[PDB]
Amino acid sequence: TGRPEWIWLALGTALMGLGTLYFLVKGMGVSDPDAKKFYAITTLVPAIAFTMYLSMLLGYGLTMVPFGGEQNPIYWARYADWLFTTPLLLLDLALLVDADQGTILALVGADGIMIGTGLVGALTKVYSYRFVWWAISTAAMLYILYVLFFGFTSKAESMRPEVASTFKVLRNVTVVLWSAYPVVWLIGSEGAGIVPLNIETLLFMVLDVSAKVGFGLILLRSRAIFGEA
Amino acid sequence: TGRPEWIWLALGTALMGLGTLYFLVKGMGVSDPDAKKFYAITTLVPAIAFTMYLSMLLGYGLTMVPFGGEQNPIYWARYADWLFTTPLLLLDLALLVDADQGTILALVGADGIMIGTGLVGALTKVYSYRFVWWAISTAAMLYILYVLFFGFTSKAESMRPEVASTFKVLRNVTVVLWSAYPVVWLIGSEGAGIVPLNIETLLFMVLDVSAKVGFGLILLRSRAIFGEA
Amino acid sequence: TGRPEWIWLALGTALMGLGTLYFLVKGMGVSDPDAKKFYAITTLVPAIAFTMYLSMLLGYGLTMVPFGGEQNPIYWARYADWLFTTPLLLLDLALLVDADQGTILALVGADGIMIGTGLVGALTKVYSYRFVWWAISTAAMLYILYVLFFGFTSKAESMRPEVASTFKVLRNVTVVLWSAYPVVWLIGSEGAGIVPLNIETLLFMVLDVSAKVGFGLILLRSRAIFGEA
Ligand SMILES: *C/C=C(C)/C=C/C=C(C)/C=C/C1=C(C)CCCC1(C)C
Ligand SMILES: *C/C=C(C)/C=C/C=C(C)/C=C/C1=C(C)CCCC1(C)C
Ligand SMILES: *C/C=C(C)/C=C/C=C(C)/C=C/C1=C(C)CCCC1(C)C
């Protein structure tokens, strides 16, 4: 194809697909209902990302949004991916540390606003307002990172050290990889246009694989997922 | 801006935003998992309404729908608000009186049809059919009001009198404020066009703040939310 | 109306509506919370299908999708129906055999991809790619049929014989009726265009009523829904 960013969309599609199959093959056999949950959730993440990467690759997940007096290529399928994948990732973390339903409700609701305010920001036709929507989404992200640090973390330690330690690593990964997303949006095609879409697509591809597949490897190789007791 | 209804969209945006912050500040500290749930649910309601009011205010949540041979301004973002907020409000009520999963399923499903049939009605291009969709949505609303009165109410009394009494007030508020919505739609911009959008926007703004913020004040100041036992 | 397929859309609308009322009237009185769940779920199925059939009948749920250098009539409202009804049908089956949350999560997620990949396939503008999306959706369907056969079936027998036997019948019905859907899509208006939309609409109408109403009659007349113990 003629879009310069095809190679990264193709790469991203292959790695999500490859990682979906691996978690599928590893998953079969497992009879533990606790482990059964983590495998379901964590395998669905790249299975979804795979379909959205494919839709971007084939060109379905792309509309042109006019702003700054020019048609801009906006991959809307990213947000449809994130709207479903980011909540499932948070659910993986909350089941580990055995969060109560209240905390889960807030995280998931806040996540919904983050991605939703992101999408509206991405399709807003007044340039200034795009940044208003980014700020609100970013404000929701910080709330989520606050809950991951101060809503549970002390209660995550008052339990199995395999759950506590495995949570500590996955939390640190989540914070570092998720924080990058707003910065890339801000300087990429959707915000200031400082970085061209080509390289922005590379950056999201690296972030998405690490945040989904990299994340899943750490979790599915740990012994926190099993109950044993 | 040049839209006459801006002042009410701006007002509504400020009050939802102001009410979101208040429930947030009041919320922090609370350690009771039952209370934790009611706070999560009831704070998310205006947080969502805030973003949709903002989108209306900035002009994103507005399309023109042609019917009666004229372009009509239709704020579609109301329905995206209600689709999420109205179920969470019903969930607040069902957790109080400890409804079973079956009853919750019906209420939420019925709510989905109500708002969905509402949206389709709002974007239908044949004037007569709009009223067909209104009737079906209104038929779903009555079903919901029947369940609130006769599916639980006797079982809501066979429990803590703080839960029973606090439910009685919130139920009466819900019935009176929710019943108005179909009437306003019917006579406003979306139906008969007897009341102009300007004043219709005022009416929904007053209804929405009372049904969301007013509602939340009553609930969050009560001692039904806490378990204690 | 001038659309040849109106008679089947009208028929389908009447039978869904008629079946919704019947399950409603039969439903009232029932006080058993287990039975309460199955009635909620199984009554919502045709209540939803009714509204989507109506939207198709009135002409709201229809867009023209250009491919093969011609505008093609595509009833998008089928997918909005299935996106909600097919998960609720699977939930009826999983509550019978008392599946764990993990298995339910996978089935529902897989179902989401099936219908989602179906919709994208239905609105893809490159003819070849439509079949790529069909293959992925069909691959998700087979996964679901595998879980219905080999993820539970042995555990469905290790319990009440009324639950085991009633599950056996409903499973066999599900497999036979669901497998037809991809074949009809493939040869109908959305795929190869071997069968005209007129007769395709007939075929989906017969499948939908049997898969929803026929299905519901078998389930709601059984004694598996009640707990008794
Ligand atoms: C699987 C992909 C993941 C984990 C994606 C995460 C994406 C975010 C955390 C995005 C955040 C954004 C903001 C907070 C600012 C507005 C723009 C967004 C949506 C990129
Ligand atoms: C937070 C806002 C609330 C509580 C909104 C409630 C809205 C309704 C109960 C709307 C009902 C409608 C009908 C039953 C008739 C069709 C038009 C609607 C959607 C306004
Ligand atoms: C109430 C209606 C029901 C049970 C509909 C079921 C529909 C399917 C199982 C559709 C399956 C499809 C594929 C697996 C291939 C792609 C096209 C679809 C969506 C028709």
PDB file of C-alpha atoms and ligand atoms in Angstrom, chain C residues 16 45 49 78-79 81-83 85-87 89 111 113-119 121-122 130 133-142 144-145 174 177-186 190 204 207-213, ligand 3:
ATOM      1  CA  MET C  16     -41.110 -11.185  18.036  1.00  0.00           C
ATOM      2  CA  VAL C  45     -34.226 -11.313  23.651  1.00  0.00           C
ATOM      3  CA  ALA C  49     -35.347  -8.258  18.238  1.00  0.00           C
ATOM      4  CA  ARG C  78     -29.417  -7.059  12.342  1.00  0.00           C
ATOM      5  CA  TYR C  79     -25.951  -6.659  13.895  1.00  0.00           C
ATOM      6  CA  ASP C  81     -29.796  -6.880  17.429  1.00  0.00           C
ATOM      7  CA  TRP C  82     -27.311  -9.770  17.487  1.00  0.00           C
ATOM      8  CA  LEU C  83     -24.681  -7.812  19.433  1.00  0.00           C
ATOM      9  CA  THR C  85     -29.312 -10.861  21.847  1.00  0.00           C
ATOM     10  CA  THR C  86     -26.629 -13.498  21.117  1.00  0.00           C
ATOM     11  CA  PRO C  87     -24.780 -12.861  24.424  1.00  0.00           C
ATOM     12  CA  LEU C  89     -28.828 -16.417  24.746  1.00  0.00           C
ATOM     13  CA  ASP C 111     -19.344 -13.509  20.764  1.00  0.00           C
ATOM     14  CA  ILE C 113     -15.736 -10.398  18.108  1.00  0.00           C
ATOM     15  CA  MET C 114     -18.005 -12.665  15.989  1.00  0.00           C
ATOM     16  CA  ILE C 115     -20.722 -10.016  15.622  1.00  0.00           C
ATOM     17  CA  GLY C 116     -18.231  -7.127  15.434  1.00  0.00           C
ATOM     18  CA  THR C 117     -16.156  -8.782  12.695  1.00  0.00           C
ATOM     19  CA  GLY C 118     -19.516  -9.524  11.047  1.00  0.00           C
ATOM     20  CA  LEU C 119     -20.578  -5.851  11.022  1.00  0.00           C
ATOM     21  CA  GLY C 121     -17.414  -7.369   7.023  1.00  0.00           C
ATOM     22  CA  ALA C 122     -20.923  -6.142   6.138  1.00  0.00           C
ATOM     23  CA  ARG C 130     -15.464  -8.866   3.212  1.00  0.00           C
ATOM     24  CA  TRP C 133     -13.817 -10.628   7.976  1.00  0.00           C
ATOM     25  CA  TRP C 134     -16.340 -13.461   7.470  1.00  0.00           C
ATOM     26  CA  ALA C 135     -13.544 -16.026   8.017  1.00  0.00           C
ATOM     27  CA  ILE C 136     -12.446 -14.381  11.304  1.00  0.00           C
ATOM     28  CA  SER C 137     -16.082 -14.146  12.532  1.00  0.00           C
ATOM     29  CA  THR C 138     -16.690 -17.775  11.482  1.00  0.00           C
ATOM     30  CA  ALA C 139     -13.441 -18.723  13.300  1.00  0.00           C
ATOM     31  CA  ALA C 140     -14.863 -17.097  16.464  1.00  0.00           C
ATOM     32  CA  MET C 141     -18.166 -18.985  16.018  1.00  0.00           C
ATOM     33  CA  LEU C 142     -16.393 -22.345  15.867  1.00  0.00           C
ATOM     34  CA  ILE C 144     -17.906 -20.810  20.758  1.00  0.00           C
ATOM     35  CA  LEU C 145     -19.298 -24.134  19.439  1.00  0.00           C
ATOM     36  CA  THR C 174     -28.167 -23.723  19.040  1.00  0.00           C
ATOM     37  CA  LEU C 177     -29.443 -22.847  13.888  1.00  0.00           C
ATOM     38  CA  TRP C 178     -26.272 -20.734  14.540  1.00  0.00           C
ATOM     39  CA  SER C 179     -24.157 -22.648  11.929  1.00  0.00           C
ATOM     40  CA  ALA C 180     -26.671 -21.652   9.210  1.00  0.00           C
ATOM     41  CA  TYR C 181     -26.095 -17.906   9.725  1.00  0.00           C
ATOM     42  CA  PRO C 182     -22.610 -17.762   8.138  1.00  0.00           C
ATOM     43  CA  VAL C 183     -23.792 -19.872   5.184  1.00  0.00           C
ATOM     44  CA  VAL C 184     -26.741 -17.514   4.484  1.00  0.00           C
ATOM     45  CA  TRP C 185     -24.481 -14.433   4.753  1.00  0.00           C
ATOM     46  CA  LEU C 186     -21.965 -16.067   2.436  1.00  0.00           C
ATOM     47  CA  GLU C 190     -23.661  -9.580   1.892  1.00  0.00           C
ATOM     48  CA  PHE C 204     -32.982 -14.932   8.615  1.00  0.00           C
ATOM     49  CA  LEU C 207     -33.761 -18.591  11.801  1.00  0.00           C
ATOM     50  CA  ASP C 208     -34.275 -15.608  14.196  1.00  0.00           C
ATOM     51  CA  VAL C 209     -37.777 -16.651  15.345  1.00  0.00           C
ATOM     52  CA  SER C 210     -36.696 -20.272  15.908  1.00  0.00           C
ATOM     53  CA  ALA C 211     -33.411 -19.277  17.582  1.00  0.00           C
ATOM     54  CA  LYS C 212     -35.218 -16.740  19.837  1.00  0.00           C
ATOM     55  CA  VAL C 213     -38.907 -17.669  20.345  1.00  0.00           C
TER      56      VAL C 213
HETATM   57  C1  LIG D   3     -31.049 -14.064  17.556  1.00  0.00           C
HETATM   58  C2  LIG D   3     -30.167 -14.268  16.409  1.00  0.00           C
HETATM   59  C3  LIG D   3     -29.101 -15.099  16.439  1.00  0.00           C
HETATM   60  C4  LIG D   3     -29.005 -16.265  17.383  1.00  0.00           C
HETATM   61  C5  LIG D   3     -28.021 -14.804  15.470  1.00  0.00           C
HETATM   62  C6  LIG D   3     -26.893 -15.511  15.347  1.00  0.00           C
HETATM   63  C7  LIG D   3     -25.940 -15.056  14.320  1.00  0.00           C
HETATM   64  C8  LIG D   3     -24.752 -15.636  14.048  1.00  0.00           C
HETATM   65  C9  LIG D   3     -24.304 -16.850  14.814  1.00  0.00           C
HETATM   66  C10 LIG D   3     -23.948 -15.001  12.970  1.00  0.00           C
HETATM   67  C11 LIG D   3     -22.746 -15.451  12.566  1.00  0.00           C
HETATM   68  C12 LIG D   3     -21.906 -14.852  11.480  1.00  0.00           C
HETATM   69  C13 LIG D   3     -20.716 -15.443  11.211  1.00  0.00           C
HETATM   70  C14 LIG D   3     -20.062 -16.402  12.168  1.00  0.00           C
HETATM   71  C15 LIG D   3     -19.972 -15.195   9.918  1.00  0.00           C
HETATM   72  C16 LIG D   3     -20.043 -13.716   9.602  1.00  0.00           C
HETATM   73  C17 LIG D   3     -21.499 -13.301   9.476  1.00  0.00           C
HETATM   74  C18 LIG D   3     -22.368 -13.610  10.709  1.00  0.00           C
HETATM   75  C19 LIG D   3     -22.343 -12.429  11.691  1.00  0.00           C
HETATM   76  C20 LIG D   3     -23.785 -13.833  10.147  1.00  0.00           C
END
